[PDB]
Symmetry: C3
Subunit: 390 residues, 3 copies
């Protein structure tokens, strides 16, 4: 009580405990995070959002498929070549680390990790269309791990559609063996035959509801010797505006502390790219269970040690702080993002406490307003400060 951690902290999603494997072989894997809403009523409004983590070895290819869900794809580490196959055309995009791209629901696509000696790590925000809680991947490919969805149609339908005998269709499309799974390893020669065509990093990508964007290609919103914060919002990008989601990429050096702060209205889903950190989230809980009886809220403390691939949810308005125990970088999706205001609770810049008039501070706290202000102005830095460990 008063201090929840582990399974007692519903906002912490340990990567080795809360991810479900959709597919996995020796060339990579796809895992989906368990539902947010099933763990806490305080995440009920994240019910139509799922998080997917993808990782593949060098020279790999995720076979063509589409899903009944909108995807906001982000490359955490490595390089990827995303190809959107449309009914009458196709577009390839080279997505370097930090780049993101929206993939409308039902868009057939495939992507490759063109790197010869580096893995590819991607995180995707998924918004299911048919059932708000779950989506399904439809693979067109026919492998030992799955049958092409085309096999879903009867012989008569297939023959008339392809204008050929089923024996042939079956031999060519369903089965000259076939691949093991949806993730296959290609040779350098196979890559260039279509990769060298893809579109590399664009200029000011944040201007097309179809072109990928790099939130790192912008002036950090916060930046000092302890950390830097890059962020792209609905106000800055079309794809983001449609999803009403903002994206953040935060770098923090060992021993840095991201000061206590809260987002006014955005619900934040963060993922550790690399590094380790200690996080503290502050919530409230009513100890009075008799509805028609006076409420009685007590401060609740939710903590966790975050590591690579871990996911943590910061409900809107909940104060939070992060102490980087090693060089760190985390990414975050801000849901209900439009006009979000990040309120810091210490330091110089963006400190909402410093905007409170002296007289109000005086009655709000034990000490005089003068003394409260003296304490407030003690910290010389803003946003990120020295965690002063040991």
């Amino acid at each position: 009580v008063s201090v929840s951690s582990g399974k007692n902290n519903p906002f912490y999603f340990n990567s080795d405990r809360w991810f479900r494997t959709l597919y996995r072989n020796e060339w990579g894997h796809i895992r989906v995070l368990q539902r947010f809403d099933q763990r806490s009523k305080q995440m009920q409004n994240l019910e139509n959002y799922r998080v997917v983590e993808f990782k593949s070895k060098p020279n790999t290819l995720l076979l063509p498929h589409h899903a009944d869900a909108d995807f906001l794809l982000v490359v955490l580490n490595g390089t990827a070549v995303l190809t959107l196959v449309n009914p009458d055309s196709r577009d390839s995009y080279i997505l370097e680390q930090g780049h993101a791209q929206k993939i409308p629901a039902g868009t057939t696509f495939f992507l490759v990790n063109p790197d010869d000696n580096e893995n590819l790590r991607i995180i995707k925000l998924a918004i299911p269309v048919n059932n708000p809680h779950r989506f399904q991947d439809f693979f067109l490919s026919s492998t030992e791990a799955q049958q092409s969805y085309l096999r879903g149609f009867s012989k008569n339908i297939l023959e008339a559609s392809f204008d050929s005998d089923f024996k042939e269709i079956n031999r060519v499309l369903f089965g000259e063996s076939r691949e093991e799974g949806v993730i296959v390893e290609l040779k350098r020669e196979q890559i260039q035959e279509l990769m060298k065509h893809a579109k590399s990093s664009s200029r000011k990508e944040l201007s097309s509801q179809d072109e990928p964007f790099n939130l790192r290609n912008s002036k950090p919103i916060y930046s000092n010797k302890f950390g830097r914060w890059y962020e792209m919002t609905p106000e800055k990008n079309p794809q983001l505006k449609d999803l009403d989601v903002f994206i953040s990429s935060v770098d923090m050096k060992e021993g840095a502390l991201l000061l206590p702060h809260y987002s006014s209205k955005a619900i934040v889903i963060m993922v550790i790219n690399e590094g380790e950190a200690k996080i503290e989230l502050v919530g409230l809980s009513d100890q009075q269970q008799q509805k028609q009886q006076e409420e009685s809220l007590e401060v609740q403390r939710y903590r966790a040690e975050l590591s690579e691939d871990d996911v943590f949810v910061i409900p809107a308005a909940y104060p939070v702080a992060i102490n980087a125990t090693s060089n760190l970088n985390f990414f975050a999706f801000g849901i209900n993002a439009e006009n979000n205001r990040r309120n810091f609770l210490a330091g110089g810049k963006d400190n909402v406490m410093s905007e409170i008039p002296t007289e109000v501070l005086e009655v709000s706290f034990p000490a005089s307003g003068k003394k409260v202000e003296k304490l407030i102005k003690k910290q010389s830095e803003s946003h990120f400060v020295d965690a002063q460990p040991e």
Copy 2:
């Protein structure tokens, strides 16, 4: 390797008209039926929970009495002709809606509907979006008949006397009836029908949120010897944009096959206007999971409803001349992806190198097969 097959009553996406419709009202002049809730039959249709489907049918020279509902309506005339009159607080507007024409009736709008034809029945399908309870709506009839009391009767005598500035005896005799019609659908004399056509606005030209529209009044998006597809999207109509819904009207001749395809993001609710057809919908099952392909099939007939979840491949074989209508939910920017033929075929956009590893045969042999069918959209079912 034979995929699992679910047919007829085992197919949650198929709604046989004689099994899944609940009668809201019926008499010798017509009937109103509401379809069973989508979300209750499958979690894969959970996002259709805010949508109800209503089928209305009435005999020649009939009138559906004035009423309003706590639901937005997208009314479509499948067969026959209708005169829809929207009564507002300060005015009224009558519109002639011929077969294929549609019109949105904002929630709470008092209205009445007439089948002005002397011989043809009127068949209508309506998409309903409830306001108070997301799952259901209620019709508030202002009329007083043997089948129902006016909602005005819900007020007390004193309130009514003060409101109408009349003794209750007069209010009662005039509006409640302490002779009244049998039900909410009545037969009018041919002479009365004409007495209500003088202000009926006939079909016009091309984009108002008030007046009705005709989706079949544009070049079909797909058209050939085997069939044609008419479609109006939210991008082409404000009423449709407000609802984020598109409407389709498809004609297919006997023996025609609507090629395997899927809608990228739209959830489709189709209804058979006339004719018969076989349909196959492809879904999937549930390391942790090995998504297996399932075939949801059914024999479709008049008035039947079938739901095609977004992104699920589907194909239709018309066994007799056929026409069906469809409502596309979550319509904005929907992309129809065909899986065969020489037009809109997403498979023909996949580079050979990818095909090479995506299927057993070589990329060369896959392309060969893909180009075999030179026809597009609709082909001979052979």
Copy 3:
């Protein structure tokens, strides 16, 4: 003729029974109405809305805090100084009776009743962000009634954050602190907090408070007056898709039977008493007219589902306020009277078959009432 009244009327919320106390001391109280959706499926779409009532004595201050919910604040009685504290600025506004203002979710704010003698009464529509059904107030202050949320952080985090040893942090911020979240201030302190506040100006701002009565009433006669502001006239209202109504009625006046086409209405009695009659349908699908009646008094809340006919008889001079949810293009259809009467727009031939009497007779009855919207109804 089944009538569901008082305690059995799910749409009626007696203020003396359905409000839960969130905070209360000798200086004021904050109460939240129980959830609408748990009372009836007919109010299921009101599940993302909560109603809060606030009352405080003269010269009082509601301490700095924020909530994970959008608030649409309305001053029913008195005057308030609302100060919104942002990350890098603050804005203070004077809100007189009848004025309203939206407080975006998570905005830290404090509220003062600057009057030296009068109390302050406010009602707020709340739209929760994390749990659609409930929100929580995060008080930054440290009082006997609640500790600052800053105390939720570990000593090491607070020490590094403020660059001070915990001893001093604790004595300054946590620890003589006030008893509760509503405190009485000295007249001198109150004056300092109101002198720089922006007074009520003229005419449509994204942040500025607005007065729904600073416009011509949409309905007005000897017996009643109705002011209304729609999303089509104010950006804050447009963002919420909510309209706000404020109507005055003389004792004995009757607001004629009518219905809102698509808006779900949540009304709150400001002052006075009235008898309300709501008409529903208790459910082929043989529907039956259901009568929902109630005697309303100050602070009571009553919900009128969209499209449901309703009538209100004032039994004393009365004023009520109302929030209209799903407001865009709502059309209020009256069922009697000389204006906005939907019945008067139905053709004779249709009336002829819709009712027992002849069309001309029905029409005769319809035009009997010369008054519009409000009429005198005294027994």
